[PDB]
RNA sequence: ACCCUUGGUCAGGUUGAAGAAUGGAGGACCGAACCGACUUACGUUGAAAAGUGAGCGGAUGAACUGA
RNA sequence: GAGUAGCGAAAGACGGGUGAGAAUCCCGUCCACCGAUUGACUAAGGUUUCCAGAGGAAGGCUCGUCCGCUCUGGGUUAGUCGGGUCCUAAGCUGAGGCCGACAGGCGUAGGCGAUGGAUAACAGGUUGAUAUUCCUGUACCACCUAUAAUCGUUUUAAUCGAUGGGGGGACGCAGUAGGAUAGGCGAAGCGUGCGAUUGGAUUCACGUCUAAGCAGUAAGGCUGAGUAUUAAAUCCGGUACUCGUUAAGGCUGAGCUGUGAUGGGGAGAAGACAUUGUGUCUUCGAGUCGUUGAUUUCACACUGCCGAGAAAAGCCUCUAGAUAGAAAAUAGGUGCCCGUACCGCAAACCGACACAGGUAGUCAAGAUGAGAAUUCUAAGGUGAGCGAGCGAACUCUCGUUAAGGAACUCGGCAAAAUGACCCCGUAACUUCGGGAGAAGGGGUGCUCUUUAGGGUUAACGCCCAGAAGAGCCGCAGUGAAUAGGCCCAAGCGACUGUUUAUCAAAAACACAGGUCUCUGCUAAACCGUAAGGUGAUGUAUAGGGGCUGACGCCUGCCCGGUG
């Protein structure tokens, strides 16, 4: 726990944009709440985190070939933290 | 003209759907059928 | 009384409606007042049992003592009201030491009148006593069937029973139909008769008005097919061409005695009328 | 189709009941929205498995409509 | 069948560019259509159709470099918005229980369930896609911790309170008024223009700002609430006095502001630079007056009516109890899940289709008007996924027609004609309401003189209406659009209403009114095997059934037969 809630960061231009500013992005488990994402990153990188905000991206359809998928469901957070800096080299 | 079916997600899920078929017997038995015919959508 | 619209329309030629004189008071109390939803013919399954019945306006019910169980307390009537369930009014009375509760109203109760119910209670219009202490020969109204159980019998606009005499634990009363029924004598009924007595005399006019107390039309038996009534079918208009004139579940209607036989009121009715 | 609970809609003008002015009654009048389907023409392998155009009827009520 | 029918309502033209290819894609100019909407929102429903690159097989009724198509990569951020969280209606479930051949049905306590009630955030900026969500500014509601300026037997208090009692929430329909308010419309400020067609030079745009926080309050509601008194309450449900109906204004309600915040973000802005190929950045910019004003808000307020118009919670007091504690004048922190893209009178929805149908609600400007009618237009969208010719027959839609005017025809079907506003007139017949807009006549343009009126007012000035004259012009003056043909007489049904969705809208059905009959209340009648219900929380002035069907005059004779 704690870092099996961050399952990856978000690298894109408008992530990039963001990163200009102290707001980072982070691909986060399903199943988690805004104040353990503030606790897991605070704990992980000892950051101080200000406020963080979710949202729930819903399956996607995909088709391969012949046959028909859909994507996983994913949830999102972004953090805006004050001092301290995420550094996702 | 108004046609049939103006859909509406919350009666489609009340009169159909897994907890209602679950509510009857004879609505378990339509579980059963499904299931015996090996249905994807079982309600 | 009555009060003749002119006929400034046709569907209002012939109308006429009560003037509302005798009201005091136009609004409920919050407190004696509890919820009536409309079930409009329809059962515990959800199907209609009794025909005729659906939409009308709203209505709160207006709780009230049938029962006139407080004893010995006076009250006083405060305001006498319109009530939309029932042909007559209603009147509020105020205990002598700060209960309220709603009675029927008699026919002529004024604001200022006092009520007491008991059995050492006087013979006055409103009064409620048991009916060993009522003289012969008084108009009664609310005349319980059973001990204790509340008013049944002569509660509509101009009813009234007269209590014609005494067997040994029943009273003989002539009820407002005709009948010469025996009520037990530990019964309870409240003298006077029943306000609103022009209540029968109003006419109504519209349509729409008699599709506002919640009725529905009604359909001539004549004229549904034979698959739906007795009366049914036919090439044109036709007769009753049967026996008799017949219901439309198969039953006889002009004169078919429908009270079941065997039952536990038939020592008790000296003559019939109705 | 009917009903239960809870909501919404009805531009604008006219008439002038009960209680000379005053008053504002009506399944009252004319008429848009809205609802309907009377006549006609068109359509009839249709734009449409019942519509469109032109007129036409109710339009504060036994109205119309949503959940 | 045949290279035939069809290509699904409509206005396009042309210059430039892009490409293998262009009526069909991109840019520009002009033109045209909508504009109570083809415009902006928001629901239901669809789910990725949303955005940026790229492609052209297929799908687009043609073409296609294009797209709601294909490939790649992206995009939905909330303590305050809508839900969960709080409450409950109709219904649905229902422990025990009642009834049931099994199955199971019913139902109490209790739960679930909005289409309702209660709940704290406003403005501006912002990208290709989101924003009461992000950022800037300023707030507000709960909760916790530290501190407290002394509240003070912790029974009572600074004050803690039920799951109980009471109050409140808390509600219909229709009328008018009234106060300000968004709008819109004229002129002070501000702005930028002053013209190459004759002429003119007091010759087009802008014109501002919130929640919060107080200060004030405009219709608008109520006082005896008066001390003391009657599993209990000394705030409330019932009683008795003094000042007494004061409005002194005591009380509870509740679209409103001068000097400040306001020499400040936004300051419809032309002013400003190296440029942000000049497409930009500083930093600089007016908010005035006085008219009309709501269908909005006070507010179901007030008044009237009969058809007599949810519940529960939040909330407020009050006790039962519970307790040595924090309120007070601060300062720090904490506030979760779900929805958020996109279409939404529509080529993303229901209609098999890029379908001429259907799809609840909110905002809805100017000129004309009474108007949300009508014609043109603003804001803003759009030119309809086939075209180019020729203007035969014949169909369809539309206009006009000499003389006659229903001679057509089953029938004046269709078409034609009246239509608006103002004045004058209007019959028979009537249930005295009506008939009735009955019928039938006359006028409406423009300019000038004149001069009543009332509306805001300090007045100028601004609105909205009158009357009498004197002219002028056309064929015509409600010069276009929109807006009753009428009358005489018979049936039928009293009337408004409702019916065969998809060949019949009527004389058929309803109806108000009559009458007969049944029914005494566990009523009759009805649904169920029963339990449970409906009737009805109704009680013979009530309920069920049969017949007839406003209103007026009447409704004869027969009881043999059957019921
Ligand atoms: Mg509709």
Same mark, same amino acid.
């Given at each position: 726990?704690?870092?099996?809630?961050?399952? *990856?960061? /978000?690298?894109?231009?408008?992530?990039?944009?963001?990163?200009?500013?102290?707001?980072?992005?982070?691909?986060?488990?399903?199943?988690?709440? %805004?104040?353990?994402?503030?606790?897991? /990153?605070?704990?992980?990188?000892?950051?101080?985190?200000?406020?963080?905000?979710?949202?729930?991206?819903?399956?996607? &359809?995909?088709?391969?070939?012949?046959?028909?998928?859909?994507?996983?469901?994913?949830?999102?957070?972004?953090?805006?933290? %004050?001092?301290?800096?995420?550094?996702?080299? | 003209?108004?046609?049939?079916?103006?859909?509406?997600?919350?009666?489609?899920?009340? /009169?159909?759907?897994?907890?209602?078929?679950?509510?009857?017997?004879?609505?378990?038995?339509?579980?059963?059928?499904?299931?015996?015919?090996? @249905?994807?959508?079982?309600? | 009384?009555? &009060?003749?619209?002119?006929?400034?329309?046709?569907? *209002? @030629? +012939?109308?006429?409606?009560?003037?509302?004189?005798?009201?005091?008071?136009?609004?409920?109390?919050?407190?004696?007042?509890?919820?009536?939803?409309?079930?409009?013919?329809?059962?515990? !399954?959800?199907?209609?049992?009794?025909?005729?019945?659906?939409?009308?306006?709203?209505?709160?019910?207006?709780?009230?003592?049938?029962? *006139?169980?407080?004893? $010995?307390?006076?009250?006083?009537?405060?305001?006498?009201?319109?009530?939309?369930?029932?042909?007559?009014?209603?009147?509020?009375?105020?205990?002598?030491?700060?209960?309220?509760?709603?009675?029927?109203?008699?026919?002529?109760?004024?604001?200022?009148?006092? #009520?007491?119910?008991?059995?050492?209670?006087?013979? &006055? #219009?409103?009064?409620?006593?048991?009916? !060993?202490?009522?003289?012969?020969?008084?108009?009664?109204?609310?005349?319980?069937?059973?001990?204790?159980?509340?008013?049944?019998?002569?509660?509509?606009?101009?009813?009234?029973?007269?209590?014609?005499?005494?067997?040994?634990?029943?009273?003989?009363?002539?009820?407002?139909?005709?009948? #010469?029924?025996?009520?037990?004598?530990?019964? *309870?009924?409240?003298?006077? !008769?029943? $306000?609103?007595?022009?209540?029968?005399?109003?006419? #109504?006019?519209?349509?729409?008005?008699?599709?506002? %107390?919640?009725?529905?039309?009604?359909?001539?038996?004549?004229?549904? +097919?034979?698959?739906?009534?007795?009366?049914?079918?036919?090439?044109? @208009?036709?007769?009753?061409?049967?026996?008799?004139?017949?219901?439309?579940? $198969?039953?006889?209607?002009?004169?078919? &005695?429908?009270? @079941?036989?065997?039952?536990?009121?038939?020592?008790?009715?000296?003559?019939?009328?109705?």
């Amino acid at each position: 726990e704690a870092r099996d809630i961050l399952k *990856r960061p /978000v690298i894109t231009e408008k992530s990039s944009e963001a990163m200009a500013e102290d707001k980072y992005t982070f691909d986060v488990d399903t199943r988690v709440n %805004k104040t353990q994402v503030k606790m897991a /990153v605070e704990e992980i990188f000892n950051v101080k985190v200000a406020s963080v905000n979710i949202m729930n991206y819903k399956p996607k &359809k995909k088709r391969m070939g012949r046959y028909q998928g859909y994507t996983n469901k994913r949830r999102k957070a972004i953090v805006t933290l %004050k001092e301290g800096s995420i550094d996702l080299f | 003209v108004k046609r049939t079916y103006q859909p509406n997600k919350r009666k489609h899920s009340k /009169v159909h759907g897994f907890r209602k078929r679950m509510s009857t017997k004879n609505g378990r038995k339509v579980l059963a059928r499904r299931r015996r015919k090996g @249905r994807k959508v079982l309600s | 009384a009555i &009060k003749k619209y002119k006929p400034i329309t046709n569907g *209002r @030629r +012939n109308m006429t409606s009560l003037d509302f004189a005798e009201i005091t008071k136009t609004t409920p109390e919050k407190s004696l007042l509890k919820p009536l939803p409309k079930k409009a013919g329809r059962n515990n !399954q959800g199907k209609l049992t009794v025909r005729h019945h659906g939409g009308g306006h709203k209505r709160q019910y207006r709780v009230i003592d049938f029962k *006139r169980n407080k004893d $010995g307390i006076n009250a006083k009537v405060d305001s006498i009201q319109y009530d939309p369930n029932r042909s007559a009014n209603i009147a509020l009375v105020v205990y002598a030491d700060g209960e309220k509760r709603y009675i029927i109203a008699p026919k002529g109760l004024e604001v200022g009148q006092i #009520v007491e119910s008991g059995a050492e209670a006087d013979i &006055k #219009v409103g009064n409620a006593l048991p009916l !060993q202490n009522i003289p012969v020969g008084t108009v009664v109204h609310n005349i319980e069937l059973k001990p204790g159980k509340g008013g049944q019998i002569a509660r509509s606009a101009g009813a009234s029973a007269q209590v014609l005499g005494k067997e040994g634990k029943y009273v003989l009363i002539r009820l407002r139909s005709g009948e #010469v029924r025996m009520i037990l004598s530990t019964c *309870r009924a409240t003298i006077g !008769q029943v $306000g609103n007595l022009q209540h029968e005399l109003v006419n #109504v006019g519209k349509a729409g008005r008699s599709r506002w %107390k919640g009725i529905r039309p009604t359909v001539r038996g004549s004229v549904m +097919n034979p698959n739906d009534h007795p009366h049914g079918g036919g090439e044109g @208009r036709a007769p009753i061409g049967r026996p008799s004139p017949m219901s439309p579940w $198969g039953k006889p209607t002009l004169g078919k &005695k429908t009270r @079941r036989g065997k039952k536990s009121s038939d020592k008790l009715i000296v003559r019939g009328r109705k």
